[PDB]
Amino acid sequence: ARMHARKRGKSGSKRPPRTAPPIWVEYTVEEIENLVVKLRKEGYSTAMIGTILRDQYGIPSVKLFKDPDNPNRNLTITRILEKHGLAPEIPEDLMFLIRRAVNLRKHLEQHPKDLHSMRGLQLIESKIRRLVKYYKRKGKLPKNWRYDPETAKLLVR
Amino acid sequence: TLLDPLANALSHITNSERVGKREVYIKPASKLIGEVLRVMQKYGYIGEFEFIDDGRAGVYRVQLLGRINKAGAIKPRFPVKVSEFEKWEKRFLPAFEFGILIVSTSQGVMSHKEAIEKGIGGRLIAYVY
Amino acid sequence: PGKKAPNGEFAGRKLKLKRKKFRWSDIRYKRRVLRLKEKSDPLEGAPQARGIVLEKIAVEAKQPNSGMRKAVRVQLIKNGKVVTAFCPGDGAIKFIDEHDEVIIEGIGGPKGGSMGDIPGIRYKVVKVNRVSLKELVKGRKEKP
Amino acid sequence: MKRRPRKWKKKGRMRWKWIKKRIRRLKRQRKKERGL
RNA sequence: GGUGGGGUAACGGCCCACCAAGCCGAAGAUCGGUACGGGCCGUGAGAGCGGGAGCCCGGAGAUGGACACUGAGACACGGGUCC
RNA sequence: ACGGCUUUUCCGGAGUGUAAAAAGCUCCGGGAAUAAGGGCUGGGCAAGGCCGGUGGCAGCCGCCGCGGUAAUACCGGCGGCCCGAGUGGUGGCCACUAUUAUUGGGCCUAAAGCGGCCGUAGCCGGGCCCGUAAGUCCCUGGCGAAAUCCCACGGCUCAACCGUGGGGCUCGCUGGGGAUACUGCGGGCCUUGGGACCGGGAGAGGCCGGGGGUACCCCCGGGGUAGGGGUGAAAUCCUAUAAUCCCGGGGGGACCGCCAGUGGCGAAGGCGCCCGGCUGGAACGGGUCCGACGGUGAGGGCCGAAGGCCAGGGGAGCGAACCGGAUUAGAUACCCGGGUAGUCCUGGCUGUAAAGGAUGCGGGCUAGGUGUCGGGCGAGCUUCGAGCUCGCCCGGUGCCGUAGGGAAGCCGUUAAGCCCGCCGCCUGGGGAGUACGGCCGCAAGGCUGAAACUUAAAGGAAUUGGCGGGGGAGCACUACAAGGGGUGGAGCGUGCGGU
RNA sequence: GGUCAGGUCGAGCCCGGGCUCCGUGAGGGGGGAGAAGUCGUAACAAGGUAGCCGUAGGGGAACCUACGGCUCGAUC
RNA sequence: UAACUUCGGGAGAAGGGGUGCCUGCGGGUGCGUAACCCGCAGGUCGCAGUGACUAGGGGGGCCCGACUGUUUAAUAAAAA
Asked: Which intervals of the chain are annotated as region Disordered (chain A)?
């Protein structure tokens, strides 16, 4: 069930079993990488880049194409972006959570009596702390890194 | 959340047998589940079983022949020696040599009878009778 | 509601602590460990005690029973505590006088307490003046 | 005060609300007598 | 805990002179209650619960404390000094 | 009862025995001679429907329970049943007790799920590949004194006892070799669990600002006279200083009528007039992104109806306390007129409810049927409507019900069924949520929390009856309604109570 | 081995502060047992004003009232 | 370093140890071996080292008034 709301929502994507790219894809792996890079330059996040590739360009998923530089792995949006040096400095989901947390704090300071929104902020910060702990364990971010709203203001800015 | 696929599969098999089903699906699949199914088929407690790939852990399709009285995983997986099998047999089975205790040993997973024949111990992973 | 926990292989510490915690809800175990009975036992854990008869009294049988049960007040030589001892027998009371040396013994009852329809009495007289009360009442011996 | 729902039943007993009020009165009297 | 020494039959904060802030603890320190520990015994189908005086091994005591002499061995139940 | 036999044991002797004795062992003489008691007798539990004594007194009774003038239950006699050199009484330990539950207990209604959620240690943790072997399993050396324990043989007549061999016990420690299925550890690759993001929609989910709805209360101006209000009936009360009632205006303070629903949203408490701004969560459709980031969570943090308290405003209607009028034997109440705190707003504290689904939370599986809310898909209608109807999928919210579960009531894919996890709570009823101790709060109060003593029961579900100032159906001149004659007032006949 | 000085171990005694336990002490508080006591009738039926939980205030005593809540509440 | 408490206090509660002179070092501010102050080691004398001078006695119950303050100049300073 959901982490907090505790209700079972089984809505999601139904990926068919595949082992190779479709035969009707009109772009090569190099062209796919170029499209990913140009979209990232435009400014879309990884999820948006994947959605745009699926919709406009008819690319079901970059994960289907093998990695030309490492035969032991398949391609990925983040892997391509880090190959070109465009990978996000901070994980995207954590950054999104921090951004909306600082926005919620801005709202709460003006509306101190919004206790329900305060509880929402508490849940958001709990999610942020969980992700921070996981990223520290995996070594993605420095061990001395800590979440503090005052610094998060500048980080979001 | 999901913790013991083996226990889930064995409980599902038991419930399906009680209801009188002829076919069952086990998900997620694993090598341990595959080997346990192999042992059960060897001893004749189940019928034909096959593996199905779906881009995920995989699924097992199993035919039930209405021969299982009760199958269940053992938790915690108690270690056991060659000479310390009678107490577990009494605990988990109705009579002597009635069912089988599926044990994971250093030479693969096998029934406690095969383990005693080979003169080795292991850890009790399941039982079925 | 839910599988009783803990059940892990490495949860022996928690299981032991749970058992230790919940063993205190058992009255018998708590009493035995704290030695509560010996703290307030007039006999100090002795099977029998000795005392001097102070006076002879009677009590009323509980409802619906009706009758006079004749007992004595005995002062223990161990610590001077005063207790009530029932006299068993059809005419046991007349065989006991004041300032007599008697031996009292627990009265068979639930939880080693009172018996029958006479609560408040926990002991019965066995020997008076170093002579068996049963023998005296039955008539085989003379009171010294 | 702790909850003993078995006490709310009125079979052969006074109302628990008023027993509770009386107990509070007794506690307050004892506290006054002690001088707290 | 360290450095340098004393003492011991022996290593040791055992003690001494100086240098540091170390060491223990909710996995229960400290404090309080109880108790000589074990081989074993009583009970139960077993898991287990309870006791651990008599026989064996080890430890302490000789009215309550504190001290020394002789000897390989004692600060000594039928040896010594003081309260 | 008669006729025979033995001397285990007792008594007296001879040897042997002993350091010397004694005890034992062989033998001679006399002889059934020298030797059975304790509890119990109503059930549990084997044993009396026998006689005498006592008549709620003596007494018995571990528990149930007997005894009040026919006692199988007390005392005594005669019988009998158990064990037997033993048999009874009292205290303690174990089983009884799955009433301590790892094996292996419970928590809707009987004891018990924190009022609710977030989360730290701990515990439990998706699939595949490679590597090490810490846990684990197998083999082999050094140990774990003896006595004690079990088996066989041998010596005291067998046995108890002891000796000779084998095994076990000391819950285990340690030196090495072999395996990597599982767990641990290091590395690699995945998407199923959980998160992030986009799209059209749903909702009394919150906070802020603006605009309204009648209704109610007060005041003024006009009309209009005598009652108004209230109860079972009255009274208090308002009213000639013009009440109640109708009309034209002004002021104020709370609440959003029907629509409204087993409807929706929120973790819970709770949230319903309309437009605008800020904001939390969830469902649906997603070949979108990360790649186990997850579950529960002792300590700890936040929220939390009503009521209460502190400071400042407000106060229409209701209304604890209080003052009056009624009823009653009394009425400190129910009933009726007034009424303070409070109920409302702005900053705080309190942290309490039958805070209840009396049901903790996440996961897999176990027939259906039928209502309704949100979303998506297909088809047919359409007045082309964000409209209507049918079917299907996921997520919510109700009812019936199969398998099965339960003491039953009842639950039954929204489990109270089976399985894998985590925390909290219960161990007969009172004493008692009390006493003492400690922390928190201004206070009220909140949290933690026993013993002495007492008790055989307390408690739950359900059945038959009986009752109800419960609902129905009927019936009756020992009921009524409509009637006729009477008794109750006087004298006397007769029968009762009293003297 | 006597005397003086110094250094150590240290019994015993006195004083102050703790901790644990034990005894009693005028009077007071509630608790449990008791037999046929006095006052009223609070609960069980719609128990005669439905019962019950939070809080608050009153009353000889069971009890009464106000705000919010549950049905473990009958009849329509 | 106690009961109590209005948490401010009670409090210098109570109670215990030291204190002279001489010979040398270390430390603070300081340019300084200027000036002021703070420790350390050793030797030594007396009955006594704040040696004179200066310089609190303390604790436990009860009544009254909360406290600071004022009052009968010339017998009452108090609970008024």
From this structure: 1-20
